[PDB]
Amino acid sequence: ERVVRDSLAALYAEEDGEVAKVDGNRIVVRYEDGRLVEYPLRRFYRSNQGTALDQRPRVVVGQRVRKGDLLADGPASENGFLALGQNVLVAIMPFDGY
């Protein structure tokens, strides 16, 4: 979680507030200050190495968000945790020389 947070890849709520608008390219949040803040989302962007880095919203309209709460997941992130691969069922055994 610290690795995900410190890379500035994901989006977190600046203050305590409530989510007003959610989209595949936009999140508009209404903070308790009364100020509307709109965060655009980076979508299908080419990295230096050709990989696609996009942010996907993880919040719903009307949801209450505290300070530091996750708003959108970055690339290789699952609910704010570093997600570099997949959890698979493995067996440790030889198999026909393959």
Binding site: Q49, T51, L84, G85, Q86, N87, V88, L89, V90, A91, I92, M93
Partner: protein
Amino acid sequence: FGKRKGEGFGVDKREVEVLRRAEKLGLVTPGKTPEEQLKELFLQGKVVLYDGRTGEPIEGPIVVGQMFIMKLYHMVEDKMHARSTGPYSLITQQPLG
């Protein structure tokens, strides 16, 4: 195992054969019920496994579990390359790299 026992199933014959083999291998203690030996194998991280091609079990218990695995940036798609003829260099007149 309680899942299996609730549905009304006992120990498989193939599991009995594997338990005999593991008893010979020294992985379980002789004199216990098949469920106790199965639990001993499970506590060693090993389960009875069946071969999908034949349906017979693997002759010994096999380590099975969840593993975290990542795909690496080295992709065969970006590497496979072939040439018959093509561009040549200015001075040496030899194929480019």
